[PDB]
Amino acid sequence: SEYIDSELKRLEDYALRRVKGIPNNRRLWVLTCMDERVHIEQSLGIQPDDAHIYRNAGGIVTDDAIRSASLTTNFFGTKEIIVVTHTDCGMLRFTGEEVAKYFISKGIKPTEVQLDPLLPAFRISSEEDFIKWFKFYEDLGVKSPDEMALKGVEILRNHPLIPKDVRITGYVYEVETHRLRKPNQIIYNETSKFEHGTIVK
Amino acid sequence: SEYIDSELKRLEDYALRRVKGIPNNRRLWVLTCMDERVHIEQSLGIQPDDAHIYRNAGGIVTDDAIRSASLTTNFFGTKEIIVVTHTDCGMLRFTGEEVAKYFISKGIKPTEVQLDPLLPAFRISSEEDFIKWFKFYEDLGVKSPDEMALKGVEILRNHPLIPKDVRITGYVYEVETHRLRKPNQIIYNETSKFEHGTIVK
Amino acid sequence: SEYIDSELKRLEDYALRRVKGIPNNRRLWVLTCMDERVHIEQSLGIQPDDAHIYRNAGGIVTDDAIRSASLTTNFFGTKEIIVVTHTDCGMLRFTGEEVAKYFISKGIKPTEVQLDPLLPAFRISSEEDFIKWFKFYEDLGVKSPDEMALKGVEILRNHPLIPKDVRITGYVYEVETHRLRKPNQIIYNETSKFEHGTIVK
Amino acid sequence: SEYIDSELKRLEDYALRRVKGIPNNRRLWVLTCMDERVHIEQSLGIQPDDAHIYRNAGGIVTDDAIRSASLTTNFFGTKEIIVVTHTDCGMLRFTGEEVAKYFISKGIKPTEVQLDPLLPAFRISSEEDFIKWFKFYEDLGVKSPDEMALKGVEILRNHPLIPKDVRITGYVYEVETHRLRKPNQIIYNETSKFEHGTIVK
Amino acid sequence: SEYIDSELKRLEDYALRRVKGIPNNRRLWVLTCMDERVHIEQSLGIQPDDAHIYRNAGGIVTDDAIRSASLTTNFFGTKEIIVVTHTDCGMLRFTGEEVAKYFISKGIKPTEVQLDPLLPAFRISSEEDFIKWFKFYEDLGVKSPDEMALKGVEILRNHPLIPKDVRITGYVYEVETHRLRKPNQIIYNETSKFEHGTIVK
Amino acid sequence: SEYIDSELKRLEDYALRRVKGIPNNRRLWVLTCMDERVHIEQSLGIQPDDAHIYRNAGGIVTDDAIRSASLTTNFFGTKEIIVVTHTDCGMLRFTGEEVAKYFISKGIKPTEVQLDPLLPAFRISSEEDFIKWFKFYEDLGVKSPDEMALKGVEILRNHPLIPKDVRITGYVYEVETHRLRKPNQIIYNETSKFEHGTIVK
Amino acid sequence: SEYIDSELKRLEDYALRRVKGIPNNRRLWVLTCMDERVHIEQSLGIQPDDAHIYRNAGGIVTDDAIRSASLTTNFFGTKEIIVVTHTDCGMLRFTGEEVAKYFISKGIKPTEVQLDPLLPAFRISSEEDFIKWFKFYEDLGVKSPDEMALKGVEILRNHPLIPKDVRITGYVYEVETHRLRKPNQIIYNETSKFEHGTIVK
Amino acid sequence: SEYIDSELKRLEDYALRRVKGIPNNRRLWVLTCMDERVHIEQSLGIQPDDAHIYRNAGGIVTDDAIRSASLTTNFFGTKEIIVVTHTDCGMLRFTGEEVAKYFISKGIKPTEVQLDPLLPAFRISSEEDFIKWFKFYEDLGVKSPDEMALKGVEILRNHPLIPKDVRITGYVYEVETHRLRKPNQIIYNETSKFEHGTIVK
Numbered sequence A, B, C, D, E, F, G, H: 001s002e003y004i005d006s007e008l009k010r011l012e013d014y015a016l017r018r019v020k021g022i023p024n025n026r027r028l029w030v031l032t033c034m035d036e037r038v039h040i041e042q043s044l045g046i047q048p049d050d051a052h053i054y055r056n057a058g059g060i061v062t063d064d065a066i067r068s069a070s071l072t073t074n075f076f077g078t079k080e081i082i083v084v085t086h087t088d089c090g091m092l093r094f095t096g097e098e099v100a101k102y103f104i105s106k107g108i109k110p111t112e113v114q115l116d117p118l119l120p121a122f123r124i125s126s127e128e129d130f131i132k133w134f135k136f137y138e139d140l141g142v143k144s145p146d147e148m149a150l151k152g153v154e155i156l157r158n159h160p161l162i163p164k165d166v167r168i169t170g171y172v173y174e175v176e177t178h179r180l181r182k183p184n185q186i187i188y189n190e191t192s193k194f195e196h197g198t199i200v201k
């Protein structure tokens, strides 16, 4: 009875965290890609309830990412951000020119497409802006996921809507090993080639 | 050895799906909220590699959602979309006016904040637009997650960038029971109030 | 040989609990419905030997419930009562008028039916009493299982045959979610609508 | 999607068996005692959702038992009844005289106690009726649980509110062995005494 | 290495117990029947290596039992004996007369059968001794397994080859409950009859 | 109803196998040693109710073994016998001279000890017979458990009280490996010496 | 009985495979490095009894490798060879000059060290031969494990002691991924750079 | 995040143990046979990353074994060696004469076969040397795996390329029991003979 009450209150508190001002278990927000192969929680070593996980095409900083990140940090008590791009990302496999050309071929008029139906204030007035909107790596002048992870970290770090006390870190998810690496730590070459090793003490 | 070869071809395929033209394992894109309590794959009954999962604050249709959905459907071969909002969502616990007022208090100037750093073409020129940008349920005139799931489905259905042959369906994730429901199909009211039954035959 | 002896005594104790003045393991009696979907022990978090479980149509306080409750508390040492009604209960799906009219249709004469064969002193002398005997929610002016759990608790609390030092509590078993809730503390509405929350401190 | 719908409908049906006129999985109603030691489903070899389980002090046919049995058989489609009394039942350890005398000692006035608060039509007008109301084995002239199981079966069989096509069977739950026996099948004497055996063919 | 020394010394002691003078884990010897239904270890609550288990037709004290018991107690360090007869024992289902008559019918000549081929000194010179040799309960004037368990205990207690410091105890295995009892301490009669219980403190 | 009925008989039959002339499930009788390390049923691959298991000091054919074997085969329908001696058996670690000398040292007078109290007809009238009665391997001129298994098989095979249609087999239980072997079929002698191998084809 | 005979056929065959001319389960021989990180069976997808696994410093073809390979193929019926070198192998981390210099520093005289004590015919008569004996990648003019896998395959393919009908294949074990790759097919470059992909058909 | 950086730094260390000069986890090198039945790590009670495992035909000390042992001990920090031969080893099933005669039959010219293609300095100049090269037990005058384990230990112990502070131990893997034993410490012969046993205390 006392047990049931105790456990019911626990449920009430879980069901209404966002009413009560209860944060996620680890005060963590993650930006990553929507890709199926990015099994994000296992790679971070976290449990289902530990983090808020934002996912878009590319794990790239968009207005929506910044929107979501500003809310979680300022209102839902998140004190840590982790940006995780990944290998073989689709955003590194195509160009916005290709995509735009693909759409005009069907009959789409870039200038007069409602990009955010729920926010008509968002408009572009240029086909070059339409191309940049898709945020493909090449169009953004980004050569690797490593560079993109660093790019996103710097953006979020410098953005006014995100508190300065929030810790922000970037990684790259390797789909070929279901696991992270530090951006630009690439030991794949180093292991298949001579390097003078040291005698064990 | 022969089985080792074709296994390596298979890992090669998995590693390079997005290069090679392989979709996710059933051709599925999911829009849902970033919330920690939304354990999305278990509720859909899917495996890690089965779907592209888009997640933002509220599981609401933003430009980024439409961007991501347009790419998966037209280029990555997704033929099904599932929109899943959830109960006790933060977007249904606050107002954009409150959030805007919070930011001005710190010293932020809504008009001159770069909302999308990587896309400077996105501007608002109005504090009312800044409020609407956050996309809180109240400000969008949406009363329930049920209504928001239906709203998102309709938007995606009617959007030109999303092919007409794509199946789109909406659900609500109940955090208090880790289980989906159809919008407006709440069993919890009907079971706790007289309703006439039928005699068994 | 010693540990075998002791074990045989406690085997003997177990088989003769009701001679030796041994109570149930938690000194608990539960009133609930006979319904198949009410998996009562798992919902209370109790083990098979922990409680005396009374079950009738509706988990409603009848003379038999009070009989059984009086015996367990006064003679079998029960110090706690838990009343548990449930959702989609049959007693909330029909009316006694319907049931009575069903029986007369077959040829039953309400006035002349022996309701308690082993206790002929129980008679009604009125078709209105026959209707009330079935104890359907509607006929008793009870709108919900929540209200019926509270009702039963109050009855047992006020009844002279039940000691005043017995703890009595009420809950509702949700068949939809195989889980208990406190009467009138339904979370499902609250989570699905706007309610203002607090910022995380 | 069609999977989720299918499973939600399965849940809809479970949650509203009683609105939808759906029976228990096995069309079974069980009368048994409230005693903790009677682990009824295990002994019948049935699963949680298979039966409606009525439980009172003694597994004795009361008005409430007949009320509940009439409803399940006529309205909820139950086609089988099993009566199961048990060994070392409390109703076989005391007398109603003892119980009545116990209550007068505290200050209770049998004549003026509301036995069924929700049904004031139930009255006794005699201390002998009050004694018989408790339904102790000895006061009913019943010597064993075996006899009581048979007695209950006969009552239910002959009662007009219970359809004649319903199968009714009686057993005795042995708490010493957590298992059932046919009433009056006592092999315990037969196994510890000489008995001419037969050679195996 | 450390581990492998340990592993090897474990095997060596276990495999050479009777050379190295190592006792059974519980310094226990059990006399019981060969019957399949007597699951002796489970009923004593012992592990495979805990005891020396002697088993013959009936769990009766024979020369071989006394031989085996004398060896385990004096040489293998057994300090406890447990005699356990059982219910529905074959030795309580037939007579030696019947068995002897059965053998003569085939053509056996009792007087000239080698009863112990490895010990020719064992002879009988009487048909009445041949009958007694089979050791059926009836022919020994024993009415119950309870009585036989007590009988065997007394014999072993008073036998000179068995040290006086050895603890000897008797039980009866109930095949119909897979469960021991003290001899002549039955409850099954007591649990299906009225008996005044006592109110719980 | 039907299920519980057929189960109660399965149980009634189980409790009264020896009255009804139902045998053990394999129609098997096993002669083995009482030693703790001989985990007999696992080594034979049998279940608890499958066999009658006779156990004495050494798994040696004694009068009691023959008594028990004659009863199980002729009356309890056993059609197979398995003799299983074992390694490091105590009967192969001492001599009857040693044992006899140990007993006289305490004060025992071999000639006047009742070897079978329940069968006074069994007498020896010689200290050499007393030695032989213990049935140590050495005194019987048996060098190995292998030889003893074969010896027991031969005795039982040629004994008139045991039907000739009964199948009799011998094995040795290796305590060092919890596993059986056929007599004098030791794999360990062959795997550590040279043995002309055969080219694989 | 006839169960135990199959059990013993299995044991006898398993333990005398090399006598009886029974091959390994997969007719496979593997050459790989002794390195701890090379979890060879898992990477080949084979079971413990499937292959003969030769391991030395580097997974390099030595006389011993050829000795072992010639025996398994010609006599033990192996029909497939798999050579698997690995990344970060020690043989690609040092030079034989370094090693030789290390040994002379301690006081070793290369010319007069017994390199094969059991085969005195193996001698070198040159410090350059001593260096080459260690078989370091650099000294052999081999740049990668990929190249070494191919080299080993070619050697074994062209060697007269190895039958021509034996299938020989080479792979590289990636310690950093605990999985295999085909010589010179490294995808990790390709997954972190732009590469034009295909629209899912 | 800090946890994640810590785990990345381990993965880097693991991937480059040989460059960075980290040993195997128990500074262990094992010499054993390539035979499938020798499940070496389970028998040693070690984990995959715990040792460097050298395997050839027979677990015999060859030049390659010494090469590999010298490198692991002097450069990779191995401080313990374990030599483990095994039962039913192929090297104890054939003779080098047989093998040589087999090869000449096909048309091989022993004198002119490149035994180590990558080390031309290795030559034999004699058919007797060719026979000895195969290193069959019989040709080396070794009678058992026990003797061979001891032999290899002594060779490695006395070899100048192996440091004197390295611990070297020998065992024999019994394929018949998947278990290691010390050289010549065979319990099997000791458990089937008579052996003076000690009385227990």
Ligand SMILES: [Zn+2]
Pocket (backbone or CB within 6 Å): A033, A034, A035, A057, A058, A059, A086, A088, A089, A090, A091
């Ligand atoms: Zn991506």
Ligand SMILES: [Zn+2]
Pocket (backbone or CB within 6 Å): B033, B034, B035, B057, B058, B059, B086, B088, B089, B090, B091
């Ligand atoms: Zn949300």
Ligand SMILES: [Zn+2]
Pocket (backbone or CB within 6 Å): C033, C034, C035, C057, C058, C059, C086, C088, C089, C090, C091
């Ligand atoms: Zn109900």
Ligand SMILES: [Zn+2]
Pocket (backbone or CB within 6 Å): D033, D034, D035, D057, D058, D059, D086, D088, D089, D090, D091
């Ligand atoms: Zn009872």
Ligand SMILES: [Zn+2]
Pocket (backbone or CB within 6 Å): E033, E034, E035, E057, E058, E059, E086, E088, E089, E090, E091
């Ligand atoms: Zn018996």
Ligand SMILES: [Zn+2]
Pocket (backbone or CB within 6 Å): F033, F034, F035, F057, F058, F059, F086, F088, F089, F090, F091
């Ligand atoms: Zn023994």
Ligand SMILES: [Zn+2]
Pocket (backbone or CB within 6 Å): G033, G034, G035, G057, G058, G059, G086, G088, G089, G090, G091
């Ligand atoms: Zn290596």
Ligand SMILES: [Zn+2]
Pocket (backbone or CB within 6 Å): H033, H034, H035, H057, H058, H059, H086, H088, H089, H090, H091
């Ligand atoms: Zn071998």
